[PDB]
Design a protein around this motif. Structure first.
Motif, mmCIF file in Angstrom:
data_model
loop_
_atom_site.group_PDB
_atom_site.id
_atom_site.type_symbol
_atom_site.label_atom_id
_atom_site.label_comp_id
_atom_site.label_asym_id
_atom_site.label_seq_id
_atom_site.Cartn_x
_atom_site.Cartn_y
_atom_site.Cartn_z
ATOM 1 N N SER A 20 -52.234 -6.316 117.778
ATOM 2 C CA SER A 20 -51.768 -4.935 117.777
ATOM 3 C C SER A 20 -52.219 -4.202 119.033
ATOM 4 O O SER A 20 -51.494 -3.347 119.552
ATOM 5 C CB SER A 20 -52.264 -4.213 116.529
ATOM 6 N N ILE A 21 -53.423 -4.504 119.522
ATOM 7 C CA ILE A 21 -53.884 -3.923 120.780
ATOM 8 C C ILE A 21 -52.992 -4.377 121.927
ATOM 9 O O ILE A 21 -52.595 -3.582 122.784
ATOM 10 C CB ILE A 21 -55.352 -4.299 121.042
ATOM 11 N N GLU A 22 -52.670 -5.671 121.961
ATOM 12 C CA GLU A 22 -51.913 -6.219 123.079
ATOM 13 C C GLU A 22 -50.523 -5.603 123.169
ATOM 14 O O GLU A 22 -50.043 -5.303 124.266
ATOM 15 C CB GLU A 22 -51.822 -7.738 122.950
ATOM 16 N N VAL A 23 -49.860 -5.407 122.030
ATOM 17 C CA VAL A 23 -48.485 -4.915 122.050
ATOM 18 C C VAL A 23 -48.437 -3.450 122.467
ATOM 19 O O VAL A 23 -47.653 -3.064 123.340
ATOM 20 C CB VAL A 23 -47.820 -5.130 120.681
ATOM 21 N N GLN A 24 -49.265 -2.610 121.849
ATOM 22 C CA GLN A 24 -49.154 -1.175 122.091
ATOM 23 C C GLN A 24 -49.702 -0.793 123.459
ATOM 24 O O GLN A 24 -49.092 0.011 124.173
ATOM 25 C CB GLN A 24 -49.866 -0.398 120.989
ATOM 26 N N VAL A 25 -50.854 -1.352 123.846
ATOM 27 C CA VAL A 25 -51.419 -1.089 125.169
ATOM 28 C C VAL A 25 -50.779 -1.945 126.247
ATOM 29 O O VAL A 25 -51.133 -1.815 127.425
ATOM 30 C CB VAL A 25 -52.947 -1.292 125.142
ATOM 31 N N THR A 26 -49.835 -2.812 125.880
ATOM 32 C CA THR A 26 -49.064 -3.614 126.828
ATOM 33 C C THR A 26 -49.946 -4.554 127.642
ATOM 34 O O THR A 26 -49.606 -4.914 128.771
ATOM 35 C CB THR A 26 -48.230 -2.734 127.763
ATOM 36 N N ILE A 27 -51.090 -4.959 127.092
ATOM 37 C CA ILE A 27 -51.896 -5.975 127.759
ATOM 38 C C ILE A 27 -51.173 -7.313 127.740
ATOM 39 O O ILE A 27 -51.038 -7.980 128.770
ATOM 40 C CB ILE A 27 -53.286 -6.081 127.112
ATOM 41 N N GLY A 28 -50.684 -7.715 126.573
ATOM 42 C CA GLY A 28 -49.907 -8.929 126.448
ATOM 43 C C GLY A 28 -50.595 -10.167 126.979
ATOM 44 O O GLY A 28 -50.174 -10.719 127.998
ATOM 45 N N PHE A 29 -51.662 -10.606 126.310
ATOM 46 C CA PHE A 29 -52.342 -11.823 126.737
ATOM 47 C C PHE A 29 -51.424 -13.031 126.626
ATOM 48 O O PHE A 29 -51.437 -13.912 127.493
ATOM 49 C CB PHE A 29 -53.612 -12.037 125.919
ATOM 50 N N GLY A 30 -50.617 -13.091 125.575
ATOM 51 C CA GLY A 30 -49.691 -14.186 125.402
ATOM 52 C C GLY A 30 -50.199 -15.339 124.572
ATOM 53 O O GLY A 30 -49.436 -16.279 124.319
ATOM 54 N N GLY A 31 -51.464 -15.316 124.158
ATOM 55 C CA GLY A 31 -51.911 -16.275 123.165
ATOM 56 C C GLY A 31 -51.236 -16.051 121.828
ATOM 57 O O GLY A 31 -50.945 -17.003 121.100
ATOM 58 N N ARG A 32 -50.973 -14.793 121.494
ATOM 59 C CA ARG A 32 -50.295 -14.406 120.262
ATOM 60 C C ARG A 32 -48.907 -13.898 120.642
ATOM 61 O O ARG A 32 -48.697 -12.700 120.832
ATOM 62 C CB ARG A 32 -51.100 -13.351 119.521
ATOM 63 N N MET A 33 -47.958 -14.820 120.752
ATOM 64 C CA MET A 33 -46.608 -14.467 121.150
ATOM 65 C C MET A 33 -45.812 -13.943 119.963
ATOM 66 O O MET A 33 -46.231 -14.030 118.809
ATOM 67 C CB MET A 33 -45.888 -15.670 121.749
ATOM 68 N N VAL A 34 -44.639 -13.402 120.264
ATOM 69 C CA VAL A 34 -43.660 -13.034 119.253
ATOM 70 C C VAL A 34 -42.577 -14.099 119.261
ATOM 71 O O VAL A 34 -41.878 -14.276 120.265
ATOM 72 C CB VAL A 34 -43.068 -11.642 119.518
ATOM 73 N N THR A 35 -42.439 -14.815 118.154
ATOM 74 C CA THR A 35 -41.452 -15.876 118.063
ATOM 75 C C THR A 35 -40.097 -15.302 117.667
ATOM 76 O O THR A 35 -39.993 -14.190 117.146
ATOM 77 C CB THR A 35 -41.894 -16.937 117.057
ATOM 78 N N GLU A 36 -39.050 -16.080 117.931
ATOM 79 C CA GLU A 36 -37.687 -15.678 117.616
ATOM 80 C C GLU A 36 -37.310 -15.942 116.166
ATOM 81 O O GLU A 36 -36.232 -15.516 115.737
ATOM 82 C CB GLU A 36 -36.710 -16.413 118.532
ATOM 83 N N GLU A 37 -38.165 -16.621 115.406
ATOM 84 C CA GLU A 37 -37.854 -17.040 114.047
ATOM 85 C C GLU A 37 -38.276 -16.024 112.998
ATOM 86 O O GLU A 37 -38.405 -16.384 111.825
ATOM 87 C CB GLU A 37 -38.515 -18.387 113.751
ATOM 88 N N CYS A 38 -38.509 -14.774 113.387
ATOM 89 C CA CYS A 38 -38.960 -13.734 112.465
ATOM 90 C C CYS A 38 -38.151 -12.469 112.717
ATOM 91 O O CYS A 38 -38.570 -11.597 113.490
ATOM 92 C CB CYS A 38 -40.454 -13.479 112.631
ATOM 93 N N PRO A 39 -36.980 -12.336 112.088
ATOM 94 C CA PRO A 39 -36.160 -11.135 112.317
ATOM 95 C C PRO A 39 -36.843 -9.845 111.911
ATOM 96 O O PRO A 39 -36.507 -8.783 112.446
ATOM 97 C CB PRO A 39 -34.908 -11.396 111.469
ATOM 98 N N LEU A 40 -37.782 -9.897 110.967
ATOM 99 C CA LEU A 40 -38.524 -8.696 110.600
ATOM 100 C C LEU A 40 -39.548 -8.324 111.663
ATOM 101 O O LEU A 40 -39.736 -7.139 111.956
ATOM 102 C CB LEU A 40 -39.209 -8.894 109.250
ATOM 103 N N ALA A 41 -40.216 -9.318 112.251
ATOM 104 C CA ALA A 41 -41.228 -9.031 113.260
ATOM 105 C C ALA A 41 -40.618 -8.443 114.522
ATOM 106 O O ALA A 41 -41.255 -7.619 115.185
ATOM 107 C CB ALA A 41 -42.011 -10.294 113.601
ATOM 108 N N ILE A 42 -39.400 -8.855 114.876
ATOM 109 C CA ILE A 42 -38.753 -8.305 116.062
ATOM 110 C C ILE A 42 -38.530 -6.811 115.896
ATOM 111 O O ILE A 42 -38.654 -6.039 116.853
ATOM 112 C CB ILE A 42 -37.437 -9.047 116.349
#
Ligand SMILES: CCCCCCCCCCCCCCCCCC(=O)OC[C@H](COP(=O)(O)OC[C@H](N)C(=O)O)OC(=O)CCCCCCCCCCCCCCCCC
Ligand SMILES: CCCCCCCCCCCCCCCCCC(=O)OC[C@H](COP(=O)(O)OC[C@H](N)C(=O)O)OC(=O)CCCCCCCCCCCCCCCCC
Ligand SMILES: CCCCCCCCCCCCCCCCCC(=O)OC[C@H](COP(=O)(O)OC[C@H](N)C(=O)O)OC(=O)CCCCCCCCCCCCCCCCC
Ligand SMILES: CCCCCCCCCCCCCCCCCC(=O)OC[C@H](COP(=O)(O)OC[C@H](N)C(=O)O)OC(=O)CCCCCCCCCCCCCCCCC
Ligand SMILES: CCCCCCCC/C=C\CCCCCCCC(=O)O[C@@H](COC(=O)CCCCCCCCCCCCCCC)COP(=O)([O-])OCC[N+](C)(C)C
Ligand SMILES: CCCCCCCC/C=C\CCCCCCCC(=O)O[C@@H](COC(=O)CCCCCCCCCCCCCCC)COP(=O)([O-])OCC[N+](C)(C)C
Ligand SMILES: CCCCCCCC/C=C\CCCCCCCC(=O)O[C@@H](COC(=O)CCCCCCCCCCCCCCC)COP(=O)([O-])OCC[N+](C)(C)C
Ligand SMILES: CCOc1cc(CC(=O)N[C@@H](CC(C)C)c2ccccc2N2CCCCC2)ccc1C(=O)O
Ligand SMILES: CCCCCCCCCCC(=O)O[C@H](COC(=O)CCCCC)COP(=O)(O)OCCN
Ligand SMILES: CCCCCCCCCCC(=O)O[C@H](COC(=O)CCCCC)COP(=O)(O)OCCN
Ligand SMILES: CCCCCCCCCCC(=O)O[C@H](COC(=O)CCCCC)COP(=O)(O)OCCN
Ligand SMILES: CCCCCCCCCCC(=O)O[C@H](COC(=O)CCCCC)COP(=O)(O)OCCN
Ligand SMILES: CCCCCCCCCCC(=O)O[C@H](COC(=O)CCCCC)COP(=O)(O)OCCN
Ligand SMILES: Nc1ncnc2c1ncn2[C@@H]1O[C@H](COP(=O)(O)OP(=O)(O)OP(=O)(O)O)[C@@H](O)[C@H]1O
Lengths: 592, 148, 361, 333
Positions: free
Chosen positions: C124-146
């Motif tokens: 949650s820190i990475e997404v909102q503060v736009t750090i985006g480490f990339g260890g915890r990616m957003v996959t395409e297989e979760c239409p709710l998460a997108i």
């Protein structure tokens, strides 16, 4: 909160409690209590498993924090008449109710059953969340702020808008009505600025003497309208007061009855806590399963010592807050009864004739004592009115469950308290008889020295001070013998007050071992009884004063009713200045 | 008053000593709790004296007003001044009641606060006593005295 | 009970001649209420404010008014709550999807590397503060998460823009610049050019000019009309006696601001005798102007009570020329020296002049 | 029927602009229009602007990978143009990461395709521009001070009464907040359908009204509620307002406009109210409101608009000059 540090409008701002302010707080306190029970159950269940199982109580622990803020958030929206922010509160009740209900129904699918406490508390939470939801919707119905084009705004009450009203007890949040929190600022102000009639401002509308007098007249006027009774007797006045002040006197009784019952939770918790500690086996623990979460049952919940101590803490807060609120409701009604009776007596003074048969009998001293003595003993009766309705209940409930705790020997010992109470009535009565002897004799000596201190120059230039002083000393000796008798009776009063409970315990425990020997008197049973004796002594040895005040109050109303129907200044309801044609004047109402 | 004053403060001393002896962990929290007790016992007396002084000095004009109306009832009705004197009575009675209402509230303010402190003692004393009855083995005897 | 009032009778004893209260009676000389304090900070407390939520409806004005330590708490809470609100969302989505189960990754995780709520919080820190480490990616297989990734970014962008705007209006705050505008402690009344006037000295400390300065003066006194009005705090404007009538002043050196007491002035009947402490008199001085740096208007409010007036005194010279420039010796900012002046009122001064003029002619 | 108001009791001018020969000036001021929008409406434009921007470049990234052959099922021999693009959903997620600058990095921009490098440049420039546009609009929305005018308060109805002999149209204006409105200003205007001797007819003539200030100006100092009165001299347009024609259907209205820069933000604000003919009470004064405390004053805002009855002549101010002149002339002789 950051703005409140530099907010000056809240210095004397007004408020407007939303429709359902009382039903919101009573539900919140109930909701807070049940959330503590869920915490207790959650921490109780997980102790058997090797893992923490944080899902049992942390969801409830977060609810307790959310519930507390939900009423802090609501209050900040109540002081500032901005209902629009209640949408966030409304969403919470809608969302919490839906999610909790899904949990409740899923328990029934797995057949949890009411035999499990978690099923009961979850079912209870659905009702509390649902009822709190209806409260928020009822705000929209009466305030009409979200959707309706024309909001029905409400203004602060006129008595509150006065800057000259500082006794803000009648209009505060229900928590401050119980804890008297609003007094904190006044108490702190007393330390710097001394309290004068400036600080004690004009009293609210509900407690104004004129407002109370109107209600008493309406009680009298409706009494003479619904019922057509020629006289205004003692019963006429007694029925009048109940009509004008019953709806508050019942509220004082309701708080006292509940506080009396909650008072015995202490002895039951003491009995419960120690009994669980009187068992060597602590390895045993609640053990029943549905999935592996090990739901705990009812009896197992109230067997843990820590659970009862926490429930005792919650019960003590309720008992000691209901009891204090019972006093205030009784007292405020008593002060208003005095306020509406002094006005009625004074209003009778204006409308009374000056006949020598009337005014030559009841001197100013007779009517002065009526306001001072007769009204105060009637006013003090309304203070203690809840006692006579509840002290029998508290003693009976005390006796009923004291029989179960120890057995028969408790009743035998407690009988000494009951048997010696009528003697204490005799002691108190004999105390007052010796008190009037001193009271009448002090006035005679004080009136005698008033002449001495009034002509002192003639009593000092004539060297009469030595002779006149001896008269005071001799009168004092006749006064001091009476005061010695009063001192004896008040000394005996203390002895019976404090030595009887020791005598009750001494007879109870020795009698139990000797005559009964039915048990070993474990700390679970013995120390539970000690609390019961402490709880029962206070009503048992003060019920004599309640009866005595009621006896005195019957005289006061009887005396007040006799005075209130005396001769009046007739022809009030019905050219030269002094135009008198016949002029057959008289003083006797008929003839003469 | 002296007999009951000494018995009141000695029972508090007697109670506090027994609670401290049963659970020595209680007196660790007693000092933070006693300080709050002192301030409640401090500000109350300042207000209680002032209210009680205001309680008495406000009812003396009331009884005298009743006595003087009875003394000169004929004169007051003659001037048709009974309309004003009744208004004085309401001003005299309201001052007497509002002085008493604040006195009652002060007693109720003290009694509620000095019973949540007592309730906080019960939870603290019960919590430590139960734990000390599970580890130090108080044997549930002094636990009861720690509660009653 | 352990109370002396356990059993008491109906008592009434005549306390004959209960006199001599001996009250302190110190309220006579307690304090004199000020209209505005010596440093602005108007000493007026409002009562019976029937607020309809307008206190908080001006949220963005309120946020700026708050002190900086409070702003840091709101800055922290507004972001910590946003991070943690969506921390519960990411944790719950990965819970419902079923990739939270510590087992072989047979499925494709909804958001990779989410193992515990700690990992849900860090993501949650990475997404909102736009750090985006990339260890915890957003996959395409979760239409709710997108959808939540869209929501968190929009809420994250919206919170930042709102919070930046509040900070900029706080960085441009110029109430601290108005504290370097100085007024003398006590103003004086003395003769200038044969006419009495109420002199005053106001100075600027910083070297940055305050543009478009504008000084106003008002008298605060209770005023009763011939019709018997009761105006508690009546404010009557006072002319600055500027050469062009306007209030505009040019503040570089500490200027003397005076009000020529003509026949149209409210101070036209002030005598030194009636200049004691408890006198119903007060002069409010309001210096306005835009700070040249931030462009934000400011006010410097000062007041002079009657006991803060000094009749018949003169302000010492302050500016003295030096080798290459002038020099303002601020040590002598408020020093006053006596002047030969009449002790009579302005009306008497005009009357005495009127009689002398007739005698001369 | 009804009587229209030029401006309502809370501003909100009730004038209907019609037959506007619109040259698109509504849309040319997008930045001004964006601020004028309500906060819920701004979020829609705020959200749809970003959401479309991500989705505009989501199609671009998906098309680039489709043309390059990257999304062909199977582990192809070619180096992917943008790594891990195996669906439009992956292209959508990569579109979000670049413009928001999250940059997870499971979907990198490789060095193979030069077209994607240009699109990566374009998306960053568009992202910085749109973000810069949205920041500016929100800063001016956060700097809005129209809601501050809601705390500026005027009495419900004004009065005309006596003060220092003359007749003045009194009033009361209060400030509820604690912050100051620097350099306050009061403009009062009388709106009446006024004809002229030349024959002109003005449907709504606005004549300015002096504030009767001490220095003949407009500046006021608003800390406690004040009385904004206008002395009705020979030049006052209210010189011929008799109490008889103060009824409802009287073409009369007093506009009051309070202006000044808010000290918190520096934004100038206006507060506007109008007193109709029926909203003026002849011969009433305003109650004293400012009490004194131990060391401060006290404003009883409960008594903000309360007016009491005060004796006064029931004749027009024009007849006051004539009555005074006759009395003065008679006293002279
Ligand atoms: C016709 C459109 C109606 C739209 C209804 C939306 C319903 C949303 C439901 C969700 C719960 C939220 C309750 C909001 C209630 C409705 C909005 C509302 O009235 O806001 C109340 C206030 C100020 O508004 P107003 O000027 O009085 O508007 C009049 C009214 N809304 C109307 O036009 O009819 O507004 C505020 O007071 C907002 C507080 C913002 C604080 C900013 C702090 C900076 C940090 C921001 C991030 C913090 C993290 C948490 C996010 C939420 C923070 C509130
Ligand atoms: C599952 C349950 C387990 C136990 C948990 C239970 C918790 C629930 C608490 C219930 C409290 C019930 C109190 C009800 C009384 C509410 C007040 C009330 O009705 O009187 C309000 C009045 C003022 O109104 P009015 O002008 O006279 O009314 C108009 C007219 N007479 C009419 O009514 O037509 O003013 C008065 O008459 C003053 C009344 C003062 C009342 C003060 C009570 C405060 C209680 C606070 C409790 C302390 C905290 C306990 C919570 C524990 C949680 C951890
Ligand atoms: C009745 C009692 C009421 C008491 C109310 C006050 C409560 C105060 C709380 C005390 C602790 C606060 C610590 C703050 C530390 C930084 C601030 C600091 O050092 O002061 C520097 C100042 C604040 O000073 P001020 O005189 O209060 O300013 C008011 C301002 N002139 C005005 O009135 O307008 O500030 C500035 O000049 C602003 C510069 C900010 C730049 C620093 C960056 C820090 C960012 C935050 C870092 C901490 C993050 C922590 C996250 C934790 C997560 C778990
Ligand atoms: C894919 C999902 C993405 C979601 C993105 C959401 C981003 C949320 C960011 C969280 C923090 C935001 C805090 C901002 C709130 C500040 C509101 C505030 O203080 O003023 C409240 C105001 C009321 O004045 P106004 O009438 O709008 O003024 C117009 C003026 N010209 C001006 O621009 O100042 O405004 C109001 O009126 C009420 C404000 C309520 C805030 C609205 C929240 C969302 C509501 C959504 C439902 C709206 C439905 C109704 C639409 C409008 C219908 C008429
Ligand atoms: C359950 C009652 C206990 C208290 C009873 C005494 C109060 C009755 C007075 C009343 O009208 O209640 C409330 C209406 O509130 C409702 O009418 C609530 C209805 C809720 C509906 C929920 C459906 C389920 C009025 O609110 P209050 O809290 O009495 O306001 C006090 C006013 N004062 C503090 C400004 C002086
Ligand atoms: C400042 C903040 C950082 C806070 C970090 C976590 C604090 C709680 C600690 C805790 O036990 O968390 C737990 C969750 O806990 C929750 O799910 C709590 C949800 C509460 C909402 C957030 C707090 C308000 C973490 O446990 P988990 O997520 O179940 O771990 C996965 C289990 N696994 C590793 C076996 C797969
Ligand atoms: C908001 C979306 C985020 C959540 C999306 C969930 C649904 C997946 C959509 C999807 O796969 O779209 C598909 C169709 O669909 C389109 O190409 C849609 C085109 C219109 C999109 C914009 C609508 C407004 C894209 O299909 P694909 O993945 O390009 O299929 C070929 C790739 N593969 C065979 C190698 C897999
Ligand atoms: C000033 C009198 O205003 C009050 C009025 C009341 C209500 C009340 O029943 N009172 C009498 C009781 C009867 C038997 C004399 C009393 C007086 C002194 C001490 C304790 C008590 N009893 C109180 C109830 C429980 C047992 C002991 C309470 C408290 C007060 C108070 O001081 O605030
Ligand atoms: C187990 C039983 C527990 C019962 C507890 C629930 C009742 C508490 C009520 C509190 C209350 O009502 O107090 C509030 C305190 O507010 C703050 O200080 C801001 C919030 C700071 C923290 C977020 C608001 O009242 P206030 O600030 O005095 O009101 C002035 C503004 N008009
Ligand atoms: C927040 C609102 C009020 C909370 C009321 C708490 C009631 C708890 C009752 C049960 C109890 O008090 O349980 C004990 C709990 O102790 C703790 O760890 C402290 C928990 C602190 C909670 C904030 C555990 O001991 P046990 O039950 O013998 O389990 C041992 C084997 N594990
Ligand atoms: C021991 C029992 C556990 C609970 C302990 C807390 C009890 C709080 C009582 C709430 C109350 O009493 O709530 C308000 C007080 O607010 C505060 O200042 C709360 C400060 C709280 C400090 C912890 C009363 O405000 P009001 O009378 O509505 O004032 C209107 C205009 N404000
Ligand atoms: C839930 C109720 C029971 C609480 C039990 C203990 C009572 C005191 C603690 C509660 C409290 O916080 O009460 C304090 C009592 O007040 C004083 O007379 C000053 C004392 C200063 C030195 C101690 C402070 O309150 P305050 O700041 O005056 O309240 C107004 C702003 N809200
Ligand atoms: C007329 C007949 C006698 C009635 C006695 C009065 C009853 C009081 C309430 C019951 C009680 O006090 O319930 C006890 C726990 O306290 C609470 O639950 C308090 C509520 C807390 C709420 C905050 C249960 O104990 P028990 O099951 O009796 O334990 C020994 C048995 N083995
Ligand atoms: N105590 C107060 N707090 C806030 N605003 C106030 C207060 N008193 C009056 N006002 C404002 O003054 C205006 C009306 O004042 P006035 O007292 O003359 O009328 P009113 O009958 O009280 O008004 P209304 O019914 O519209 O509230 C309104 O804009 C109202 O909001």
């Amino acid at each position: 909160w950051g703005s409140q540090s530099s907010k000056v409008h809240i210095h004397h701002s007004t408020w407007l409690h939303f429709p359902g302010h009382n039903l919101r707080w009573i539900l919140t306190f109930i909701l807070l209590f049940v959330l503590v029970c869920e915490i207790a159950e959650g921490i109780l269940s997980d102790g058997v498993t090797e893992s923490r199982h944080l899902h049992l109580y942390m969801p409830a622990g977060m609810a307790f924090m959310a519930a507390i803020t939900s009423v802090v958030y609501y209050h900040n929206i109540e002081t500032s008449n901005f209902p629009k922010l209640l949408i966030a509160l409304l969403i919470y009740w809608t969302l919490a109710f839906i999610t909790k209900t899904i949990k409740f129904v899923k328990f029934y699918d797995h057949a949890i059953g009411f035999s499990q406490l978690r099923f009961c508390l979850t079912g209870l939470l659905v009702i509390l969340y649902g009822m709190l939801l209806l409260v928020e919707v009822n705000v929209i119905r009466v305030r009409r702020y979200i959707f309706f084009k024309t909001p029905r705004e409400v203004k602060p009450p006129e008595d509150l808008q006065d800057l000259g009203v500082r006794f803000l007890q009648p209009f505060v949040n229900l928590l401050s009505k119980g804890t008297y929190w609003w007094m904190n600022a006044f108490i702190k102000t007393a330390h710097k600025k001394p309290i004068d009639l400036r600080a004690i401002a004009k009293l609210p509308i509900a407690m104004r003497a004129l407002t109370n007098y109107q209600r008493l007249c309406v009680a009298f006027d409706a009494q003479a309208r619904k019922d057509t009774q020629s006289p205004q007797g003692a019963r006429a006045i007694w029925r009048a007061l109940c009509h004008a002040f019953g709806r508050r006197l019942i509220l004082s009784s309701t708080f006292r009855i509940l506080a009396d019952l909650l008072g015995f939770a202490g002895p039951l918790c003491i009995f419960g806590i120690v009994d669980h500690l009187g068992k060597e086996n602590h390895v045993f623990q609640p053990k029943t399963q549905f999935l592996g979460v090990y739901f705990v049952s009812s009896q197992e919940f109230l067997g843990n010592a820590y659970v009862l101590a926490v429930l005792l803490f919650l019960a003590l807060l309720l008992q000691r807050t209901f009891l204090q609120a019972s006093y205030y409701v009784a007292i405020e009604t008593g002060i208003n009864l005095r306020g509406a009776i002094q006005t009625k007596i004074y209003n009778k003074i204006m409308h009374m004739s000056t006949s020598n048969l009337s005014m030559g009998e009841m001197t100013a001293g007779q009517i002065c004592n009526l306001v001072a003595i007769d009204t105060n003993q009637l006013m003090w009766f309304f203070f203690l009115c809840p006692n006579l309705w509840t002290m029998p209940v508290q003693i009976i409930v005390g006796v009923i469950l004291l029989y179960y705790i120890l057995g028969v020997s408790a009743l035998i010992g407690a009988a000494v308290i009951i048997l010696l109470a009528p003697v204490q009535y005799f002691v108190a009565t004999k105390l007052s008889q010796a008190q009037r002897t001193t009271l009448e004799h002090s006035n005679e000596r004080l009136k005698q020295t008033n002449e001495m201190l009034r002509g002192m120059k003639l009593l000092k230039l004539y060297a009469w001070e030595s002779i006149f002083c001896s008269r005071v000393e001799v009168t004092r000796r006749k006064e001091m013998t009476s005061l010695r008798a009063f001192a004896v009776y008040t000394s005996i009063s203390i002895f019976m007050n404090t030595a009887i409970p020791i005598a009750a315990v001494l007879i109870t425990f020795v009698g139990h071992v000797s005559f009964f020997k039915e048990s070993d008197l474990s700390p679970s049973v013995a120390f539970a009884s000690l609390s019961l004796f402490h709880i029962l002594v206070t009503p048992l040895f003060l019920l004599s004063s309640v009866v005595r005040s009621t006896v005195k109050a019957l005289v006061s109303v009887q005396k007040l009713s006799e005075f209130l129907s005396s001769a009046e200044i007739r022809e009030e309801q019905c050219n030269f200045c002094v135009q008198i044609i016949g002029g057959f004047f008289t003083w006797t109402p008929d003839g003469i | 008053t002296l007999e009951c004053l000494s018995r009141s403060t000695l029972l508090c001393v007697s109670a506090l000593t027994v609670i401290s002896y049963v659970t020595p962990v209680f007196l660790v929290a007693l000092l933070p709790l006693a300080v709050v007790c002192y301030f409640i016992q401090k500000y109350f007396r300042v207000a209680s004296r002032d209210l009680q002084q205001l309680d008495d000095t406000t009812q003396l004009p009331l009884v005298s007003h009743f006595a003087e109306t009875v003394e000169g009832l004929t004169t007051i009705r003659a001037f048709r001044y009974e309309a004003r004197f009744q208004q004085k009575l309401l001003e005299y009675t309201d001052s007497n009641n509002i002085a008493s209402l604040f006195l009652t509230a002060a007693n109720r303010w003290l009694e509620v606060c000095m019973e949540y402190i007592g309730a906080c003692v019960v939870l603290i004393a019960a919590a430590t006593s139960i734990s000390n009855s599970l580890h130090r083995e108080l044997s549930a005897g002094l636990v009861g005295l720690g509660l009653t | 009970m352990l109370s002396r009032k356990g059993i008491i009778p109906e008592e009434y004893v005549l306390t004959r001649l209960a006199e001599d209260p001996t009250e302190p009676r110190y309220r006579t000389r307690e304090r004199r209420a000020r209209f505005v304090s010596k440093k602005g900070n108007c000493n007026v407390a409002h009562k019976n404010i029937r607020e309809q939520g307008r206190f908080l409806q001006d949220v963005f004005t309120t946020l700026v008014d708050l002190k900086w330590p409070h702003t840091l708490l709101i800055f922290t809470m507004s972001f910590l709550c946003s991070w943690l609100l969506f921390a519960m969302v990411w944790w719950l989505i990965a819970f419902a999807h079923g990739d939270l189960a510590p087992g072989e990754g047979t499925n494709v995780p909804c958001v990779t590397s989410i193992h515990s709520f700690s990992s849900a919080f860090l993501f949650s820190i990475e997404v909102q503060v736009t750090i985006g480490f990339g260890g915890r990616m957003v996959t395409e297989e979760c239409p709710l998460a997108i959808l939540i990734l869209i929501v968190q970014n929009i809420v994250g962008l919206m919170i930042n823009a709102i919070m930046l705007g509040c900070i900029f209006m706080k960085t441009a705050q110029a109430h601290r610049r108005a504290e370097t505008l100085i007024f003398s402690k006590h103003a004086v009344i003395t003769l200038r050019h044969g006419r009495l006037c109420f002199m005053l000295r106001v100075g600027d400390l910083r070297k940055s000019m305050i543009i478009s300065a504008t000084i106003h003066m008002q008298v605060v006194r209770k005023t009763t009309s011939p019709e018997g009005e009761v105006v508690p705090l009546h404010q009557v404007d006072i002319p600055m006696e500027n050469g062009v009538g306007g209030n505009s002043i040019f503040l570089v050196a500490p200027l003397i601001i005076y009000h020529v007491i003509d026949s149209n002035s409210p101070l036209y009947d002030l005598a030194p005798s009636d200049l004691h402490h408890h006198q119903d008199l007060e002069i409010i001085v309001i210096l306005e102007g835009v700070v040249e740096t931030t462009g934000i208007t400011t006010q410097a409010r000062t007041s002079y009570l009657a006991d803060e007036i000094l009749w018949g005194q003169r302000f010492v010279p302050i500016v003295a020329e030096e080798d290459g420039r002038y020099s303002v010796d601020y040590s002598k900012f408020g020093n006053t020296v006596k002047v030969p002046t009449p002790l009579c009122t302005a009306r008497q001064l005009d009357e005495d002049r009127s009689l002398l003029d007739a005698l001369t002619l």
